[PDB]
Design a protein around this motif. Structure first.
Motif, PDB file in Angstrom:
ATOM      1  N   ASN A   1      14.630  13.941  70.953  1.00  0.00           N
ATOM      2  CA  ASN A   1      15.061  13.660  72.309  1.00  0.00           C
ATOM      3  C   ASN A   1      14.341  12.406  72.828  1.00  0.00           C
ATOM      4  OD1 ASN A   1      16.857  15.908  72.595  1.00  0.00           O
ATOM      5  ND2 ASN A   1      15.193  17.245  73.268  1.00  0.00           N
ATOM      6  N   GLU A   2      14.858  11.814  73.907  1.00  0.00           N
ATOM      7  CA  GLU A   2      14.274  10.596  74.491  1.00  0.00           C
ATOM      8  C   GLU A   2      12.783  10.725  74.817  1.00  0.00           C
ATOM      9  OE1 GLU A   2      16.570   8.982  77.719  1.00  0.00           O
ATOM     10  OE2 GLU A   2      15.421   7.147  77.887  1.00  0.00           O
ATOM     11  N   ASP A   3      12.343  11.934  75.176  1.00  0.00           N
ATOM     12  CA  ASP A   3      10.925  12.206  75.448  1.00  0.00           C
ATOM     13  C   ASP A   3      10.003  11.995  74.251  1.00  0.00           C
ATOM     14  OD1 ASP A   3      11.644  14.481  73.931  1.00  0.00           O
ATOM     15  OD2 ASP A   3      11.379  15.855  75.606  1.00  0.00           O
ATOM     16  N   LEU A   4      10.598  11.879  73.062  1.00  0.00           N
ATOM     17  CA  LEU A   4       9.877  11.764  71.784  1.00  0.00           C
ATOM     18  C   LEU A   4       8.905  12.941  71.550  1.00  0.00           C
ATOM     19  CD1 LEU A   4       9.077   7.849  71.709  1.00  0.00           C
ATOM     20  CD2 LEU A   4      11.263   9.002  71.166  1.00  0.00           C
ATOM     21  N   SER A   5       9.273  14.106  72.078  1.00  0.00           N
ATOM     22  CA  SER A   5       8.400  15.284  72.028  1.00  0.00           C
ATOM     23  C   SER A   5       9.165  16.557  71.719  1.00  0.00           C
ATOM     24  CB  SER A   5       7.622  15.448  73.346  1.00  0.00           C
ATOM     25  OG  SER A   5       8.492  15.548  74.458  1.00  0.00           O
ATOM     26  N   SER A   6      10.460  16.571  72.027  1.00  0.00           N
ATOM     27  CA  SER A   6      11.315  17.727  71.754  1.00  0.00           C
ATOM     28  C   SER A   6      12.560  17.389  70.911  1.00  0.00           C
ATOM     29  CB  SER A   6      11.694  18.449  73.056  1.00  0.00           C
ATOM     30  OG  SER A   6      12.602  17.685  73.833  1.00  0.00           O
ATOM     31  N   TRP A   7      13.235  18.435  70.433  1.00  0.00           N
ATOM     32  CA  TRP A   7      14.349  18.325  69.503  1.00  0.00           C
ATOM     33  C   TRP A   7      15.637  18.907  70.074  1.00  0.00           C
ATOM     34  CZ3 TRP A   7      13.305  15.362  65.484  1.00  0.00           C
ATOM     35  CH2 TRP A   7      11.959  15.216  65.083  1.00  0.00           C
ATOM     36  N   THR A   8      16.765  18.306  69.696  1.00  0.00           N
ATOM     37  CA  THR A   8      18.098  18.906  69.866  1.00  0.00           C
ATOM     38  C   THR A   8      18.687  19.186  68.482  1.00  0.00           C
ATOM     39  OG1 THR A   8      18.550  17.825  71.980  1.00  0.00           O
ATOM     40  CG2 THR A   8      20.452  18.607  70.740  1.00  0.00           C
ATOM     41  N   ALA A   9      18.872  20.474  68.187  1.00  0.00           N
ATOM     42  CA  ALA A   9      19.421  20.957  66.929  1.00  0.00           C
ATOM     43  C   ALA A   9      20.870  21.344  67.187  1.00  0.00           C
ATOM     44  CB  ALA A   9      18.636  22.165  66.460  1.00  0.00           C
ATOM     45  N   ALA A  10      21.776  20.901  66.312  1.00  0.00           N
ATOM     46  CA  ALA A  10      23.206  21.064  66.573  1.00  0.00           C
ATOM     47  C   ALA A  10      23.715  22.473  66.254  1.00  0.00           C
ATOM     48  CB  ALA A  10      24.004  20.032  65.806  1.00  0.00           C
ATOM     49  N   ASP A  11      22.953  23.218  65.459  1.00  0.00           N
ATOM     50  CA  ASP A  11      23.377  24.535  65.004  1.00  0.00           C
ATOM     51  C   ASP A  11      22.195  25.346  64.506  1.00  0.00           C
ATOM     52  OD1 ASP A  11      22.978  23.572  62.291  1.00  0.00           O
ATOM     53  OD2 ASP A  11      25.065  22.868  62.259  1.00  0.00           O
ATOM     54  N   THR A  12      22.480  26.568  64.052  1.00  0.00           N
ATOM     55  CA  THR A  12      21.442  27.494  63.613  1.00  0.00           C
ATOM     56  C   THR A  12      20.734  27.061  62.335  1.00  0.00           C
ATOM     57  OG1 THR A  12      22.992  29.009  62.510  1.00  0.00           O
ATOM     58  CG2 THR A  12      22.505  29.446  64.822  1.00  0.00           C
ATOM     59  N   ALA A  13      21.398  26.259  61.501  1.00  0.00           N
ATOM     60  CA  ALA A  13      20.744  25.667  60.338  1.00  0.00           C
ATOM     61  C   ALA A  13      19.723  24.640  60.782  1.00  0.00           C
ATOM     62  CB  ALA A  13      21.757  25.033  59.411  1.00  0.00           C
ATOM     63  N   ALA A  14      20.147  23.745  61.684  1.00  0.00           N
ATOM     64  CA  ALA A  14      19.264  22.712  62.249  1.00  0.00           C
ATOM     65  C   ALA A  14      18.085  23.310  63.000  1.00  0.00           C
ATOM     66  CB  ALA A  14      20.050  21.766  63.145  1.00  0.00           C
ATOM     67  N   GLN A  15      18.321  24.465  63.622  1.00  0.00           N
ATOM     68  CA  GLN A  15      17.261  25.256  64.270  1.00  0.00           C
ATOM     69  C   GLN A  15      16.151  25.684  63.313  1.00  0.00           C
ATOM     70  OE1 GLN A  15      19.080  28.530  66.360  1.00  0.00           O
ATOM     71  NE2 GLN A  15      19.757  27.229  68.052  1.00  0.00           N
ATOM     72  N   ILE A  16      16.489  25.908  62.041  1.00  0.00           N
ATOM     73  CA  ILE A  16      15.461  26.190  61.018  1.00  0.00           C
ATOM     74  C   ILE A  16      14.601  24.946  60.749  1.00  0.00           C
ATOM     75  CG2 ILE A  16      15.000  26.927  58.591  1.00  0.00           C
ATOM     76  CD1 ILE A  16      16.074  29.168  60.510  1.00  0.00           C
ATOM     77  N   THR A  17      15.248  23.786  60.703  1.00  0.00           N
ATOM     78  CA  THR A  17      14.519  22.521  60.590  1.00  0.00           C
ATOM     79  C   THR A  17      13.628  22.311  61.820  1.00  0.00           C
ATOM     80  OG1 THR A  17      16.195  21.485  59.161  1.00  0.00           O
ATOM     81  CG2 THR A  17      14.695  20.017  60.354  1.00  0.00           C
ATOM     82  N   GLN A  18      14.193  22.542  62.998  1.00  0.00           N
ATOM     83  CA  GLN A  18      13.453  22.404  64.260  1.00  0.00           C
ATOM     84  C   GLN A  18      12.155  23.208  64.257  1.00  0.00           C
ATOM     85  OE1 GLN A  18      15.784  22.831  67.925  1.00  0.00           O
ATOM     86  NE2 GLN A  18      13.931  23.209  69.131  1.00  0.00           N
ATOM     87  N   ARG A  19      12.244  24.467  63.825  1.00  0.00           N
ATOM     88  CA  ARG A  19      11.083  25.362  63.806  1.00  0.00           C
ATOM     89  C   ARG A  19       9.999  24.853  62.861  1.00  0.00           C
ATOM     90  NH1 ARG A  19      14.641  30.930  63.120  1.00  0.00           N
ATOM     91  NH2 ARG A  19      15.981  30.631  64.969  1.00  0.00           N
ATOM     92  N   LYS A  20      10.401  24.284  61.724  1.00  0.00           N
ATOM     93  CA  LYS A  20       9.464  23.716  60.759  1.00  0.00           C
ATOM     94  C   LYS A  20       8.824  22.440  61.279  1.00  0.00           C
ATOM     95  CE  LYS A  20      11.845  23.666  56.745  1.00  0.00           C
ATOM     96  NZ  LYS A  20      11.883  23.589  55.247  1.00  0.00           N
ATOM     97  N   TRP A  21       9.618  21.614  61.954  1.00  0.00           N
ATOM     98  CA  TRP A  21       9.129  20.353  62.506  1.00  0.00           C
ATOM     99  C   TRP A  21       8.259  20.574  63.746  1.00  0.00           C
ATOM    100  CZ3 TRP A  21      13.642  16.243  61.825  1.00  0.00           C
ATOM    101  CH2 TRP A  21      13.865  16.088  60.452  1.00  0.00           C
ATOM    102  N   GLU A  22       8.548  21.634  64.494  1.00  0.00           N
ATOM    103  CA  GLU A  22       7.694  22.029  65.616  1.00  0.00           C
ATOM    104  C   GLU A  22       6.329  22.497  65.110  1.00  0.00           C
ATOM    105  OE1 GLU A  22      10.331  24.643  67.582  1.00  0.00           O
ATOM    106  OE2 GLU A  22      10.961  23.176  69.085  1.00  0.00           O
ATOM    107  N   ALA A  23       6.316  23.291  64.036  1.00  0.00           N
ATOM    108  CA  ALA A  23       5.062  23.774  63.446  1.00  0.00           C
ATOM    109  C   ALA A  23       4.241  22.644  62.836  1.00  0.00           C
ATOM    110  CB  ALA A  23       5.330  24.863  62.406  1.00  0.00           C
TER     111      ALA A  23
END
Lengths: 9, 100, 276, 9, 276, 100
Positions: free
Chosen positions: C127-149
């Motif tokens: 996202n523009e904040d360079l701190s959070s993510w927009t995941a397009a679907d539940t697969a991308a949400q798995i990537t999001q969780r890994k990248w957040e960790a």
């Protein structure tokens, strides 16, 4: 509940 | 899956002048997936040693490529681009028209 | 002025035909400056603009290694996505990444980017904040969780705010002759008879850089958007771009029509007419 | 110049 | 008893990373009851206590719109303050606002508040009279002059004396199970040997609500303030708070030491000893 | 500008009992500005899916936050919080001690 805020610094 | 068909433009680098060396371009864009076959033709036959740009894409992720070759336009010589893509049942031919 | 730097990456799997094709290119504004292609014989990142050639062998060494690493990362990522989407090993799939930064006239960060796509659709974006993510679907949400960790957004932020901006500034300076020069369109109007009753007026814009341009036709002053055929801006192959706009006009009424050109390299915005 | 990329999908 | 309502707002600019982060929370006494965060995906004000959930969709609609308006006001205010303090556009800056009201046992206004801070320092505050301003500096004095002309103090007074008090009364009633219940501390003394010569006595206070508490150590009756390590009252995460007080005591002399606990939920004030 | 360093406390919600599920808390307070990085660690490694409270502040305008996670204390498992803030040259680690 909140107050609407209708002024600027 | 998402599949988008190519837009196609065939045109010269500089305005066409008969007898003067120029570049023939075929610009393909807005397609997905990226696999695509492009030929430039002179009088119905494939021009050899046609070069192309490196695969890149626009904000919407759809791809674009420029295919180009040195050419010397004349009154009688007919040029064209032939494009094949998964989205097409048969190759699309677009003739080069110097007015476009 | 305002400028941008981007790196585009595309990996395409090809089952039964070896490892995926990897192609990445780098741009500053509308100028291609580096490229790497995995199917070249001994792949290296190569310059594509004169102002980058001055970088030392260590720049090209590191750039090349980053490109090889990304290709390898992408190969694994493509295997991973077959899992996330319950897909067969039979088909060809596409992974795309873009990242980079925009700077303003002063050279301060305006905006940073980092986004991925799978099979031509949005996957995950910083996202523009360079701190959070927009995941397009539940697969991308798995990537999001890994990248957040793994605190990936924090790493991208450090780069997008630091090196991306610093190196872009450096490139703008070294490439000041071209990157800081706008080439105005060369313009003319052509007349293409359709019959005894109508003709096409075509307004050309040629040899301009950067690509951004506005071409419109007016009749008596009003806007002919609904009737104007406007082709996509196209590259000439020498750094410059072309475009044309066309209206079908009643024979004899040509002088009612005016073509209007705006582009940053023009001293003044243009107004043109068919000159028989 | 490029960013090294140190994460997987 | 006496109660309070507060709304806290914090805007933090982030140049080159989009618009400022806005976070506001509402409290009744030591209980969080609403929150809004601008970086949530589709930001709405959300409940954080069971007694507010009963409010209709129109409450949440209006609360949400007020929050969006404030965020936007803050964005402009933050630009304004760069001017007042002759600051660069490069850095991150913080704007904070709090407002609310205190009521007594009878539910009559005791005191109203409205105050702003810029970069963690006092900016402007509404005085207790709810009619005049205290400006911390010459920049704040420019705000004061605008708010005096616009009769802002009069608007805040109308709210602080009316709605703030009326809605607080309403919340205390709807939340009477929790907001009107004090949970006394659960207390014990632990013994932590330092050597053969000294040990630490630690007096615990756990599970209390509201946060306000007094923990002191006495030796023979006299006050050991100078020797007592007193940690900051800390939230347990379930609505209740914790605190401890500790003294270093000579080995064997433990029974000279008494811990004293006062808290509103205790039937009687406590006196405790280490129980080996 | 005004910058204040965080106070840090690491502690459990309920008194620690080995084998019994509990909450590990890291409470950061009295800091300014509000940007802060907090990790809860188990045996030196970052615990995933740690939640936190919404940013608020005390009368003196300094901020506070509670970071928390479900945990089951044992005899051997070591817990800690790692805090980074502008006021710190390096992240501060505070070990969880069940006696504090």
């Amino acid at each position: 509940r909140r107050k609407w805020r209708r002024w600027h610094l | 899956m998402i599949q988008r068909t190519p837009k196609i433009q065939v045109y010269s680098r500089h305005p066409a002048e008969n007898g003067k060396s120029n570049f023939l371009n075929c610009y393909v864009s807005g397609f997905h997936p990226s696999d695509i076959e492009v030929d430039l033709l002179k009088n119905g036959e494939r021009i050899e040693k046609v070069e192309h740009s490196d695969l890149s894409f626009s904000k919407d992720w759809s791809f674009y490529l420029l295919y180009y070759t040195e050419f010397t336009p004349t009154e009688k010589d007919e040029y064209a681009c032939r494009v094949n893509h998964v989205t097409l049942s048969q190759p699309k031919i677009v003739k080069w028209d110097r007015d476009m | 002025g305002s400028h941008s730097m981007r790196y585009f990456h595309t990996s395409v799997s090809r089952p039964g035909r070896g490892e995926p094709r990897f192609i990445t290119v780098g741009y500053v504004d509308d100028t291609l400056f580096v490229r790497f292609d995995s199917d070249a014989a001994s792949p290296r990142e190569e310059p594509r603009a004169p102002w980058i050639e001055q970088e030392g062998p260590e720049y090209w060494d590191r750039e090349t290694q980053i490109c090889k690493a990304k290709a390898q990362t992408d190969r694994e990522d493509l295997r991973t996505l077959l899992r996330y989407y319950n897909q067969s090993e039979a088909g060809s799939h596409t992974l795309q990444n873009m990242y980079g930064c925009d700077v303003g006239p002063d050279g301060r960060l305006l905006r940073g980017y980092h986004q991925d796509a799978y099979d031509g659709k949005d996957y995950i974006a910083l996202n523009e904040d360079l701190s959070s993510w927009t995941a397009a679907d539940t697969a991308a949400q798995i990537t999001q969780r890994k990248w957040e960790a793994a605190r990936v957004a924090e790493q991208l932020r450090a780069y997008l705010e630091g090196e991306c901006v610093e190196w872009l500034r450096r490139y703008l300076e070294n490439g000041k002759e071209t990157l800081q020069r706008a080439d105005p369109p060369k313009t003319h109007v052509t007349h293409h008879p359709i019959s005894d009753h109508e003709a096409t007026l075509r307004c050309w814009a040629l040899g301009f850089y950067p690509a951004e341009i506005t071409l419109t036709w007016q009749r008596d002053g009003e806007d002919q958007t609904q009737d104007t055929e406007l082709v996509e801006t196209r590259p000439a192959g020498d750094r410059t771009f072309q475009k044309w706009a066309a209206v079908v006009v009643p024979s004899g009424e040509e002088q009612r029509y005016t073509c209007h050109v705006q582009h940053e390299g023009l001293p003044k915005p243009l107004t043109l007419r068919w000159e028989p």
